[PDB]
Structures are given as C-alpha cells and as structure tokens.
Design a protein around this ligand. Sequence first.
Ligand SMILES: [Cl-]
Ligand SMILES: [Mg+2]
Ligand SMILES: [Mg+2]
Ligand SMILES: [Mg+2]
Ligand SMILES: [Mg+2]
Ligand SMILES: [Mg+2]
Lengths: 49, 836, 49
Amino acid sequence: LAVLPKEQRAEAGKRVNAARNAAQRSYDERLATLRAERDAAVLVAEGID
Amino acid sequence: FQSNAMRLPYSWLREVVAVGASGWDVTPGELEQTLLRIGHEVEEVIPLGPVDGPVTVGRVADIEELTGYKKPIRACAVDIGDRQYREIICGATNFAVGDLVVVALPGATLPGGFTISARKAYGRNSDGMICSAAELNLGADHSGILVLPPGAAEPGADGAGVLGLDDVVFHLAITPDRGYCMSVRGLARELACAYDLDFVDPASNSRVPPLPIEGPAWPLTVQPETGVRRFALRPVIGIDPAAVSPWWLQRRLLLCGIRATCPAVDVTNYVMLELGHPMHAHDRNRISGTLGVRFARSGETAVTLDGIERKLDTADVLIVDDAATAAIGGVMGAASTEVRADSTDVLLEAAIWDPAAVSRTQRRLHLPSEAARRYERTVDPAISVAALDRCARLLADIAGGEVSPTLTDWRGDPPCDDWSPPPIRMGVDVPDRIAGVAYPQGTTARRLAQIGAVVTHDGDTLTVTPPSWRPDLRQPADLVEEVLRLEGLEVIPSVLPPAPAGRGLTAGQQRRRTIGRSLALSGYVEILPTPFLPAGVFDLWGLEADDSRRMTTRVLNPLEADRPQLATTLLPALLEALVRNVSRGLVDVALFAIAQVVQPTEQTRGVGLIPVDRRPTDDEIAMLDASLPRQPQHVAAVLAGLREPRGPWGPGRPVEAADAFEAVRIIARASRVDVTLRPAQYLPWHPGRCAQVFVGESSVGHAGQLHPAVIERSGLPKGTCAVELNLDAIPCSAPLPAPRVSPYPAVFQDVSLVVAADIPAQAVADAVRAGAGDLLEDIALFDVFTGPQIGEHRKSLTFALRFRAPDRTLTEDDASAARDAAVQSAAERVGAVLRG
Amino acid sequence: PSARTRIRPHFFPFTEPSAEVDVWFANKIGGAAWVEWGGCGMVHPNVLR
RNA sequence: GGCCAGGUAGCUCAGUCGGUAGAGCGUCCGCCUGAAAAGCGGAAGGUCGGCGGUUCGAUCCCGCCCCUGGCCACCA
Ligand SMILES: [Cl-]
Ligand SMILES: [Mg+2]
Ligand SMILES: [Mg+2]
Ligand SMILES: [Mg+2]
Ligand SMILES: [Mg+2]
Ligand SMILES: [Mg+2]
C-alpha cells in the first residue's frame, strides 16, 4: 500500500483491511477451539498416582 | 518555590549569642558537634565562597543589547573602581545601568576552580563576568545575576568583604517537637544552654521600650472555634515605595533561603527568621472594612498571591474582609490585599493560628510555606506584639514613614494574659534515675531554668512551669529529656540489664527455621514475596468467581494502581519471581517462601478510636483482633527446568510433579508430622497431577504440576510444578518414641497385587499393613506394571515385605500366614487380586 | 567489637527521651559517613498508660 | 506530592512523526560432532505500556491514564 499513489490507497486499503480481518477472525476462533479441546483433554486424561 | 529545613548563617547566630556572652566564637566543626550532641541534626555546613583575586563590586555604566542570538545579550561597561571600565558580555536580564553588581575579573578564581580569564563571546571581548549568587557560592541564584542595593559599597570594593564570604551556613533538620528552634532566637538560646552562657533574649523589651498603645488599630472579629490564640495588628503609614532593603538584610534573607522582594515583605521574613514569629504585611488601603477570621464554606476558593486558585475545605481558617479573602490563615496571603510596588500604608499582622489546622491545610494544599511550617510546630504566643513592634520599627527605618501609635491586640475570649503551660511536679532525682547517672547536685534545677522554666523546690519535689515557647514540655519525661541532652548522652554508662530466664524460641519459631534449613539443603532458594498480587492473576489462573482466593483485602493507595489486592496465596508472587529468574539466564530454578498471607472474612472492617488514656478492655482487645483479616503463615515452593543438573553422570533430570510431592514430604519431615496425599482437582494445578495434602483428616494444602493453560497464559516454563501449604493448620507435635530393637532375624517376602488403575498405591500399602499385623516391620513399593498381561485400566503393584518377631525366629510359613492375611485385607479394602 | 557507632538525641512520639543510633558506613555511596541504624528511647509514659 | 527523562523481542537497547521495526546476546533447525560449542547457513518470537478518538489503516497524530529510572520534597 505504500508504493501505491496517494489517492489510490484509500480504496486498496479497505480491501486489504477487510481481507486481513477476515483471516485474523478465522484464526482467533480456531485458536480458541483448539485451546478448549486441550483443556478438555486435560480433564479426562488419566491422572498420575 | 519553597525550601525545607532551617538554614542560618553562623555570623547571625554568633551575633545574637554574643550580646549576652561577649566574644563567644567557635569553629564550624565544634558548633556542628555541639548541635548534634544536644539533639539538632546538622544536614549541611556550607562555607561561603571561597574566592581569590579580583572579585570586586562594580557599577553598570552602559548597556548595549546584542541581537542575532538565542537570548537577549548585553554588552556592558562596568566601573570597577579608580575610574576604570571593563567591557563584559553578560546573559542575565535583572539589572539596568546604574546597578551595583559583583564582577569577577581576569585573574579571579570562583568556587570552585573556575578560573576567570578574558574570554571572547559573540564577536566581542569580555574582561570577566558579572556573577550570580550561585556562581559565588553565596545563595541560590534564582536564574539571574546578583544586584546589590544602592550604597551597599563603592565600585572597586573587595567582593569577599562586601559579601561576607567568610561566613558559614548551617542547614539543620529540626525535629517537630522543637518548633522554637525554627529561628535564630531558639537556636541561640540552645547554644547558650549548651555552653552555659548568659543569654539575652532578642524578643524582649530589651534595648528600646515597646511602641506606644494610644488606641485601637484596624477592627477585628474572630469566629469562635477557629483556634486562633492571638491576633495583633499595627500599621505603618507613608512608607517610600521606591525604598529597597539594605544589603545586610538582603544577604541574611538570601543566606536563609528567602528571596528578597521589597522592604515591607523583607522585614516580615527577617523578623520571622530572627524571632520565630511569622509576620504578614497587608496593603492597608486595599482592606475593605472589618477584618474577620472565619472558617471557609464548602466549595469556596481563594486566589493566593501567586495567582493560583485553591479549592478550600471547611476546616481551613481564613482572614476575610467585607469584599474578598485576604489570607489562608497561617499559610499564604491572598492577592487581594498583598503588598505591591505602589503600596504606601502597611498593616502588619502578627497572629497565632492553631498548629493542627495549619498542618492539615498546608499539607492538603501542598503549601509548606515558611509561615505554615512554623505554625504547625507551634509559635510562642507571648511574643506577638514584641515581634510586631520590632517589625514596624525596622520597616519605618528602611523605608521611612510613621509608626502609628495604635494597636489591635486580640488575646482570645476571654483575654489570655499568661501564656505559660501548666506546672509539672517531678522528683529532683528523676533525671538521675532515668539516666543511670548521678549528676552533680543541682544539675536538674540548673538545666530546667536554663531552658526557661520557673523551678520551685520543696522537699525532694520540683515544681516546674515551662516557658511559653515550650508547649512540648508536659510531663516529667519531657523534663528528663531536657536535662539528659544538655548534659550529653556520652555520660550515660553502658549496662546490660538482668533479663529473667527466658524460654527461647517457640515451637512454631523453631519449626520455621527447620523447614527453611531443610528446603534450602534440598536445592530451594528463598524469596521474600511481595504481598501485592499481579494484575488479574486469578483470571489468568481461570479461577471460579466464588473461589475463596478471590476474596482479597485491598490497599487504597498501592505502589501500582493495578495491584491493590493483598495476596491470599503465595504462589502468584513465587511464580512471578520464577519468571523473573528464568528471564535472566537461570532456567533450572527452585524457589520457596515462608510468609503470611491475608484472608479477610465477614468481620474484617474498622474499629473506632479507643481512648489511649487507659488500657483497652479485654473485649476491645478481642474486637480489634477479630476485625483484622486472618493472616496465617504459609510455606510455598515452585520449580521448573532441570531438577537435577547434568554432569559426568549423564544428562540430568527434568522437574516433575513427584518433585513437588517430595517437597511436601521434606516440609512434613521438618515439621515432624505425617501427611497423606490424595488426588484432587484444584486450579492452578493440572487436575491429573494434583495432590491435596492432609494431616490427619485436616486439609493443609496442594502440590503438583501446574495446568498447561495457566502456564501458557502466565508465560511460565513448560512443566512448572508447585506446592503451597498452610503452616498454621499443621499442628505442632512432640513425638516421644521408645523403640525396641529385636535381636532376632527377619523374613523377606514380596507380594504382587492387581488393582484398578485409579486405586492409589498408598491405599494398597495401608491395606497390606492393616491385614498383616504386628510381624510386619517394613513395606516398600518397588514395581508398578501395566504391560499386556494386565487388564485394561488395571495395574500390578509389587511390594517388598519385611517381617520380624520381637521374641523369636519366624518360619517361612509364619510370614506367609501374615502375607495371606494382608492379601485378604487388600481384597476387602481396595479390591486387590493376588497376581497370577 | 571494632565497629563505630554513635548515639544522639532525637524524637519519636512513643519515646521520651528519644535517640537515634548511627553506624560508620565505610562503603556508603559517595564516601564513608555516619548512617542511621535505628531509633530508640525510654518508652513514653502515654504508651505505658 | 514537584521536576527531568523514558516504556520497543526472553535480557540490554537502537529506531520509525500513518501501510517493512531492527541490533547484540537468549531460543530453534541443518551441515559439523560419539555428543557438544565455535564457524557457515537458515528460521521462530513483539498486541512498539493501556484505553479511547481521528483515519480505509495508528508504535508514530489527538485526548485521558498507568508504570520505570533519576533528581527534589515529605516522615514513625
Ligand atoms: Cl488384570
Ligand atoms: Mg522532649
Ligand atoms: Mg525365602
Ligand atoms: Mg526522625
Ligand atoms: Mg524490556
Ligand atoms: Mg470510521
């Protein structure tokens, strides 16, 4: 976006911001889901004596 | 803008001491030791100067400003005496042509080391510099050069002589019980005491009679309950606004940390420094109607004479007139009546405000003025008119005008006429007894009269009436301190007391040492843990909202605004310390702490003030203790990285949960109690590697590996393990064993039992002990096996058994019977199946 | 037995007479000097009461 | 509570006044070694102290706040 001319950046940045947020949002939920599974696996794992 | 301690030049002090004791003179070094000896902390001894060579008075004859540079730059010709002129480039801006200034010419040496040679600057030559008070080591320069008042000296006069540079400035930190020592008056009196000198009090009717009192001056009303003790007013009419203070006055104000402004204000500060009674000057033409002293109303404001608005509260005492606030009483005057350039008629104010009221007000408003810090330590009410008269005469002397023969002197309702505190009765030998020194006969009466008290002597009792400037003298112990400090503490001998036979350390105290020793021997390093929890730690742990650890005592004003909660558990602080050490290169770490925690309850709240003139009753004592949060001693430990370092013997052993269980057993052995460990779920521990620790059937804590999410969210190392026990819930114990050593041989057998995988190994061993009875001398697990021969969710345990009789050799069949009874006990209590 | 101490009159609300004890601290930052060690005195009669 | 300077990676610090932000040491991998380290080669790791606002987009601009170091000040 820094190489773009000054008046072409506004419209390009919108697309870039929306595309990056879409992928960032998908990462957050997957991180969460995999964290929840890790903690639920901790609960049912057999303990040590 | 405001200074701090008691500064005064030696010459002034000497002058006042010398009136009574002609020619008294001591070195600064001796004076320092004498002051320390009698109880005045000497923070600094500042010899003025020194200067060498041509540092002389000069007069600015011509100024030429120099444009093109960052600041205004003046090219001045200065008359340096004997009709000679020097060009000098100077930076400052607080002088005009005609001013007497102090020049340091080529060949001079300034404190300290700055050799003055003719230098160039801004395309012009400079035969020296015009000095500031700082550059001369005279005072604080106030970002400007020093102008001497007209007539102070001639151009060419020797600067060191004119400036009195052979003086020495003492900076003392006066203790708050000695308000009378915030002046030359009190300090001179203390020295006359310490040197046994005849003393002339500078605040008495002395050398000139008091001023006449032919009628009332300005009218005054004082609101009841304001704590004003005295309020005197006397005007000086028709002073010369163009007058300035003479050099001797300006210098003394400068040496004492006070910047000189104009004669009316300079005189109030000078007399305040000399006598200890703060004085205020009002422009008399700017007062509207009756002067009133009253409390401030809620939300009221006042503009002090620095142009700053102050939010007032209702405990602040004001001086007002009909139109505006004249002063925040005893703290700072208001702009409305302040003396200024044009003022010709001055109304001088000598008042005594309530010490506590001034203390509250000045500290809340952050105005520790020269007046305020004197009134909060109390001011001698007997000298208000004496200081008033001294002030008025001095001001008429400097600036002209007439001292009016009128005086308003309000001395309370009803008028108080004797300002001495109540008399104190004390045995004549009481100082001797407290000191453990037999003082020469008559020492106590001599010393107490020296400090100004009236002493009457009947039998072996003194009746001692303190002087009005000593309101700190209220009981015999106060008087004892006076005698002892003047005689000097060095005469008191050093004698160890006879202690009765003590009982030494308590059991709890001994046990804390033993636990400490043992953990340190096992590789743990002690930290002393902060009681302020990390921000949101229990959220990072994921604790339930009703977890008791979240019920914390809170600090109103903590070190870190985000850490006001006091710790209910030591683990947060230990874990923070763990991260700290690991972050600095020491990845293999074991830390412990032994410290109290803070656990409030329902009854954790305030208890109102109880009068301190009696013992609190046993019910009040118990209510005070019951109102505090519970504060039990805990012991805790954390470990991460390698538990055992690598070496020639192989690569070393990573920390594991079993190391945390061993730390529990180290603590229990040190405490000489038995513990049992049971599986538990309890954040922040891993629910499958967590033990709850029991003594008897009382829970005392938890141990094991921390939960992986807690580790991830707190930035802790993988595998961190931890222990925390409540020491106060571990009972003391005094085991008295009486072993009997059987001379007969023992029998060794082993036994393999299969149990469900969730049965703890220790519950099997206990069942084996239970069934086997008295022949069983020892049992030790040595094998846990879960291979393919063992069903799923089951495990095979094998124990080494040692049997021995106290009175016979056993047969193999005798042990086998005991083993078979153990096997049956294990089937009955834990479902064990004899391995086949 | 060789360390340098000194006792001098001072003040505390709960003692009378009061004193402060300094020790000669050779390694003080900026040069050796007396440094406050602690406070002391005879227990104030208001405290006993 | 006053003033000055700061807050950037695991540690010690540069740097950017709107779209790429780093170094030295610390961590990880390959070659190498029996295993290491060095050397060569190559990676990971930062919400640029917090929260708002402006903006398509803020470590950087605006506002409010918190904290660190130093120098004052205060005091049991
Ligand atoms: Cl089986
Ligand atoms: Mg006293
Ligand atoms: Mg056998
Ligand atoms: Mg003190
Ligand atoms: Mg850092
Ligand atoms: Mg927007």
